Design a protein around this ligand. Structure first.
Ligand SMILES: [Mg+2]
Ligand SMILES: [Zn+2]
Ligand SMILES: [Zn+2]
Ligand SMILES: [Zn+2]
Lengths: 672, 673, 668
RNA sequence: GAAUAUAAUAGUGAUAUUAUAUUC
């Protein structure tokens, strides 16, 4: 049955007003959605019918809402359907939309179908419901859909538009430093969604506050490790490496992001290093590549060491040199691997010493010990920045004798689609189903979760380990511990993290006050302001087009970034669906080898079968993948794996995305 | 009359069942009514041929008067005589008969301590119920702890006869310097042992109600930077170095300016210059006086630097201007004239630097930003602003009144009573007058204050609290929340020192430990807890039973003025009144001092303050003590802190802070002489 | 607080040590005057000596208010402030309490009782006595008794020092004086009763006083009575139906006070009717009692109907016949109730028509409408004579749609101590604290307040609905509307009321004139005249029966049943009367007391009633006295009968019953 | 239970009746 504050939140929407509904995470948004949809569909007369679309930007939420909606609206004469990438191709989208009254949808589907024209107008819908509507900004699919919406609204405008509902726990305030800037941001968000009302709980605050409780937050400022002999050894290793790199080619503190941002630039600048003798250029470029890569890995190791155990860093390095040893053994790689193996002894000697322990981990252990001593039934979630740090802390917990009461579990993202990393959806679902009080896992170590997501087991202890986020995620993560007495511990040694979190707190205050102020305005006047903002933003958006770079028709050569080997020419390149890039000719097929794809999935009219690597003298550089497009079995490459050196001027240039590499892109033809 | 909220009955329940109890609940939840419930039930529980006698302990006169009034109006109907005894009504009255002929007695704990000590009240068995307001003060050498020492001594000792039930009232028991759960539990258990408490009562079954009555304000942390360019500091520092050189050029002598380190140093140096020896001894007077003047001016300059660092340069410069204004109109002095003119030299440059808007304190700017924002969002905002010193109070009032951007503010002042023998602070009827004007429809919009002892009387609710460079304990942290019980109240901690923020965070974690420890203790069996606190009591008593006097000195000494080293009197002339106060005999001493009418004439003990006495030699005007009417005698009373002790024989000069540390042949005052 | 100049002026004679009567308008702040006088008085004494003040308040609210104010004020100066009232008077050492305190707030009756006892042997223990509302110092009032002690010590050979005497009032009164001479006589006699030699009034600061206390403008409203008389017709022949019924049992201008007096006399005459057959005497006497009671109730209903709605009277009778039932079945009660129930229809038909309205209620409604239309923020106070009229006008206001803007509250006395009527003190405090501008109530219906009392919310509109009073009450009521623009409306249908209020105004003139004339006299001469009046009054006061030892029977006044014999009666504390033996225990039933109070050494537990065949006539109460649980009876509930002669006599008070009164003894 | 005051109505008045309020 409906809680009164849910009816309160749904009321403005039930009156047909475009509404941004803002309420605490876990107060029950699903049911509000159900109310709004029900009322909306039942309001039409006989000769007319309604059609609702529900946007969820995550597959688990998509499936959940699809399930609940179909189970709920079955009794009523309303057909519910769902569409995602898993079921998107060779299906008549327009028919599915037309033959159903409720459509749960990944926004990208609607974007693609709007662009391709299969869905000519949003007038087909009478109600659009954006889950996590705060994402309606910039180049997000939500904002694309609303760009279509507003383009229709401010344009010829002769077709009718659907009602718009947004759901969120925080509208955000941007980089606002005062209430008026925050108010401006909020008004612009309302404009992006064409919203005239922001709905919040006011008359039922008691009811809401005996369902959702705000966890008590604590700040923990510890200090760095005063002694780091580990860093003293690794530093010498790194400067030996860059000394070798300096020796081969004659043209910032270690363990920092600055050194990483530097070494990435250096590696990017060594790739374009050119010589008349191509062999020597190849040798030197590959050598510098390996050098910069090793340096990067050493830096990563230092970072891991400062954020966790020395053993975790040393194991990271061990697995890296394992990586390298397995992937062909080169003489310079032999030199570097050696160069790690003399110091390996001293490193393991330093790491085994209890003297050199991270105080951050000691404080974390102190918190865990205290809380679980007070309550052995404690359910904990532990957020960190990187997956390496996830595994690191898992090993630390499983290793620490004083934490034997903990049963650690892991929760990371899917990782990159073309890399054997991350974690599949069924694995996540498995560990999450295992993560209960009656389950196997006691504490869940995780990186980060996009928005609210599916409700998991309630955690009476949240720990933010060197964790930085915005105000939105700050408000959202409260949903992890809704039970009264829940605690959140921000643990760090950066001081700036603390200030950041406090700034986010003040930003929450600004947001709430701005909402309160905005709600006192007259709706008509606010609609006028909204329209003005929409016209303003549309003008700025249309003015920002600037399309003009003339496609270079002079044929260029693509050289492997690692070994500078000639992959192919731009003349051989064909573009499929204006997005993907393949190569024709039997010549190119002998320039690469293939290995079975780690994460095979049928994206678009493609079917990943394998990853392709450089074949030239053990290079094994990632060039792209191999797919089964329609009737053809063809390779697909990425420009960030090559170097554009054109025949004439002979100057090498780097591109990260094909959208920036302007040349005579020839469309793909089956008759070729 | 009213009607008890459920959680109030829940809090009162262990007490009504006769258990010794510490009631711990948020500030403003309504403790007076809980007290009334407990007292009413307690008194009405006795049969016909018996009667109860309740004593209530408030350690503040306002709370004393409040509780006296409330209990009087409440229990008069039920036929229970209510009375009270404060320091103002404790002398020349039969305390024993007053306690005997009343059912409820509101009391300042010191009255009971002194009357137990004298024997006018032979035992606590006369009471059947003792209530300690702000019971967390029951520790160390606090009067509460003295009373409970008497109580416990009667308990454990062969002493018997019935002991009264003991109730304590607080919002926070504290955890002391605990670092974890076990230490916090140790501390809390030791407090329960101090109060002989077997039960800690909190709200559990009616949390929703309480939360609908008392809301926790949202706390924000504001870290800002200090001013970076400070010419004021440079000029003042140069003045300080000049004064130091002047001090060195007169006497052979042997940290940074604007710190507590410099303050400790200059105090040490002043005290050291006081024991400077010369054979001439009339040049000793000149040199010592000069050094005293120099060190005093240096101290004032340092204070100026600090005020400047926490406020406007104008505030510091006005502080100095007021200081030299006090130096003037006191009398002419070559040294004082020299220093004054040395200040008047740099005065122009100082004023020009002080008027430049490019040197505004960013802390005051952020404060102004906060006030502006919150009053823009709600012009009916009632604000309370806590600062460290009274100088900063005055400074911030002046700043607010002098700031056009804060024209919507109507600042009021709230400070302590100040030292009893100085014309500073603020009188109680003044605090009352200002607090009564501190309303939404009153004359004042924002209240600038130093600090408050515990909770105190309920003033107007503030939806905005601002801690300006403020550092307190977990108890005061929890207590100050009562200033904003309403939903939506906000508290801003504004500082430029990260240690402050960190300290408040530590306090929050300490609150967590306190709550968790209490929750843990509440699960224990009552008998086990009784046993544990009994063992703690027995141990602490065993320690206290033998935790040693020293021998006096019969050799006659001299008391010289610390400023001018002039002979005031000999220790042979000194008599001791009531083992605490010290007077001088002989008509010789009468020619050594001048006097002015006392700024705060109050009757302490058997004395009545009439005047303050000062050194008379060559307009020294150094504070020696006071002049009072004790019994029938009009006599002076002096503090040892004003003099230096020079032994006749050895010639050694020594300093003593308290008379209790000055071990000499203390002759008792005798009216027969 | 900083003193206003007229307060310093009024206080000045007292601070000079003069026995003074301070007379100034209500609301000018007499509390701070008292504080000034007390502060100066206590602080004037040298070191080796000390002063002691006693403050007299005749009301518990004033008592507690003054106790609190004096406590808060004088605590810091070093003076212990205490108080004693009836609630805290028993089993406490009064002498020690007085001795160990500097300022004692007191209900005068406590001092009277302790003076009579001997615990306080003399008034010499006090150095200053202050009488709040000193105009009460007359006749057999507690103030006057205290002053009888005072003056008996003064004029007597007692050389002991007497305390300075201060009185506080807004009107000294003039009695029934017809001219300035008699007024001056009376005022001089009051000054003699208080031993005052000075009357302090504002003179040099009248302009200051008149800007703090404004005199409200009075208006006189003479309206017409009920021209209609149908309701009265019905109830009238109902009354001679009942009168014929009563006349058909034994031998021998409705809606008036004379008829009420007469029917009371008739009931009290029927109570002594005797016969050979005592049972038929019982039946007949009970009959006559019931009939007379019904007649009385009908009369009361008529009065209510003339001063209010017919519906109010009909509801009064309805409530009456509602309480006649649930008390028990009586043949005659059933008869009468039937005789009423048959005409109920016509009565309500008459009470429903809108052509039936009291012109007085319409005029009051017009006044309220005009005043609240001119000012909706109006705070009205409406005085009536009876609580029945209070409830009646409350119902009339809440019923009338034209008075929708009104939020009527109630303010009555505490009623008789042994009845389920009136209103408790905390209830009074509740409604009063609700009666504010921004409160729950706009208009407050009330009967009468003892003197000035505690300051309530300022009423810019005061209405006297058929309400006469003396000059003192007239002057005091002005305190209800001190703000400029305050109005008073004397609404009535009698020329008597208006004429007596005008007479009161003239009496105020006489009073002020007499005072101003007295203030010109030499103080020595005035003291001589005062001493003269005091000596005369003492001579008169020190002016000049055998108890019938024959046993008597106490019969129930209603059913003539035997309660007890006078031989069984014992007297406690020379005032109360109890019964011994197990026999009397079979004669009465009891109900738990509606107002359990702890007066004296007694604690009220229950009311007691006649038990024989559901007579239920109030005989008295049942109390806890020390260790014993005993009945206490009132003689006005019984008919006395002599054993030998058989005479039947009535007594309204025990002190008028001169029989052999045996002192109660625990050893029996 | 008792005491007290005010007002109205009877009586020349002492006083009495009712109403109202207060107190122990
Ligand atoms: Mg009547
Ligand atoms: Zn390659
Ligand atoms: Zn001196
Ligand atoms: Zn009877």
């Amino acid at each position: 049955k409906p809680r009164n504050y849910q009816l309160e939140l749904a009321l403005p929407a039930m009156k047909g007003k475009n509404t941004i509904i803002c309420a605490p995470t876990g107060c029950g948004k699903t049911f509000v959605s159900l109310l709004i949809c029900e009322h909306h569909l039942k309001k039409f007369p006989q000769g007319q019918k309604g059609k609702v679309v529900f946007f969820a930007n995550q597959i688990p939420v998509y499936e959940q809402q699809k399930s609940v909606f179909s189970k709920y609206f079955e009794r009523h004469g309303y057909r519910v359907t769902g569409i995602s990438g898993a079921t998107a191709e060779n299906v008549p989208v327009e028919q599915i939309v037309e033959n159903n009254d409720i459509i749960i949808l990944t926004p990208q589907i609607l974007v693609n179908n709007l662009k391709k024209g299969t869905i000519p107008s949003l007038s087909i819908f009478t109600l659009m419901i954006f889950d996590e509507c705060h994402n309606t900004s910039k180049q997000h699919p939500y904002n694309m859909i609303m760009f279509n919406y507003l383009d229709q609204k401010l344009g010829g405008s002769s077709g009718p538009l659907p009602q718009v509902i947004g759901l969120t726990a925080s509208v955000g305030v941007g980089d606002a430093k005062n209430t008026d800037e925050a108010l401006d941001y909020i008004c612009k968000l309302c404009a992006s969604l064409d919203a005239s009302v922001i709905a919040t709980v006011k008359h039922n605050l008691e009811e809401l506050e005996q369902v959702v409780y705000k966890p008590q937050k604590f700040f923990r400022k510890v200090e760095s490790r005063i002694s780091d002999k580990f860093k003293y050894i690794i530093a010498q290793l790194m400067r030996d490496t860059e000394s070798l790199a300096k020796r081969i080619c004659k043209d910032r503190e270690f363990g920092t992001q600055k050194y990483e941002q530097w070494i990435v630039t250096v590696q990017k600048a060594c790739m374009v290093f050119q010589m008349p003798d191509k062999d020597e250029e190849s040798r030197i470029c590959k050598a510098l590549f390996l050098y910069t890569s090793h340096l990067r890995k050493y830096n990563d190791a230092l970072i891991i060491s400062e954020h966790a155990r020395m053993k975790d860093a040393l194991d990271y390095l061990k697995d890296f040199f394992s990586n390298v040893r397995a992937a062909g053994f080169d003489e310079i790689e032999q030199d570097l691997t050696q160069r790690f193996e003399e110091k390996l002894q001293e490193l393991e000697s330093v790491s085994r010493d209890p003297s050199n322990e991270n105080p951050k981990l000691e404080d974390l252990c102190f918190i865990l010990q205290e809380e679980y001593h007070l309550n052995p039934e404690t359910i904990t979630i532990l957020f960190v920045k990187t997956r390496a740090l996830v595994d690191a802390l898992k090993n630390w917990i499983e290793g620490n004798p004083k934490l034997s009461f903990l049963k650690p579990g892991i929760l990371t993202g899917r990782g990159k689609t073309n890399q054997n990393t991350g974690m599949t959806l069924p694995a996540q679902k498995c560990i999450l189903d295992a993560f209960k009080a009656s389950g196997d896992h006691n504490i869940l170590i995780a990186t980060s979760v996009a928005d609210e997501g599916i409700d998991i087991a309630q955690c009476n202890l949240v720990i933010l380990y060197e964790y930085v986020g915005n105000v939105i995620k700050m408000i959202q993560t409260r949903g992890r511990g809704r039970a009264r007495g829940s605690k959140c511990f921000l643990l760090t040694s950066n001081a700036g993290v603390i200030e950041k979190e406090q700034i986010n707190m003040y930003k929450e205050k600004m947001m709430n006050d701005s909402i309160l102020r905005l709600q006192t305005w007259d709706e008509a006047v606010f609609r006028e302001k909204i329209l003005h903002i929409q016209t303003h933003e549309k003008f700025i958006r249309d003015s920002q087009e600037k399309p003009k770079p003339v496609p270079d028709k002079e044929n260029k050569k693509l050289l492997c970034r690692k070994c500078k080997a000639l992959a192919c020419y731009t003349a051989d390149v064909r573009v499929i669906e204006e997005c993907h890039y393949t190569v024709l000719g039997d010549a190119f097929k002998e320039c690469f080898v293939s290995r079975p794809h780690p994460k095979p999935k049928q994206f678009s009219s493609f079917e990943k079968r394998a990853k392709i690597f450089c074949a030239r003298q053990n290079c094994s550089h990632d060039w792209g993948i191999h797919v089964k497009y329609k009737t053809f079995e063809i390779p697909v490459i990425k420009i960030e794996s090559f170097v554009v050196e054109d025949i004439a001027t002979g100057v090498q240039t780097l591109y990260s995305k094909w959208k920036d590499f302007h040349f005579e892109k020839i469309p793909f033809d089956p008759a070729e």
